[PDB]
Design a binder for these strands. Structure first.
Length: 49
DNA sequence: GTCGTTAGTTGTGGGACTAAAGGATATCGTGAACCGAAAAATTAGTGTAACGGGTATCCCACAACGCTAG
């Protein structure tokens, strides 16, 4: 609860895009984009409700 | 010589498997003793009859004419 409350979705998404853009490993990039999917899904949810 | 990377396994985990009818199941093992709770049953106590007028209603019966003289 505390960790997810302290989370910042916009900053987290920007950090993940940066990490994907500056990573020399394909697997790390895949993990970064996979987390970005869920982060952006939550961001899109926060617009409707 | 040593460290990160990539691709191809390899083991492991989560998700599918016509339609129609019908549709009954049986379900162990035991430790004691006292207190409290409320739900139930048993027991103890009080009682009328006709009368005066006057009047409201009911049922029950009957009436509600015809002629003659001053």
């Amino acid at each position: 609860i505390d960790l997810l409350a302290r989370i910042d979705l916009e900053q987290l998404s920007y950090e993940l895009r940066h990490k994907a853009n500056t990573e020399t490993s394909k697997q790390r990039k895949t993990e970064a984009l996979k987390r970005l999917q869920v982060v952006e899904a939550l961001r899109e949810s926060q617009d409707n409700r």
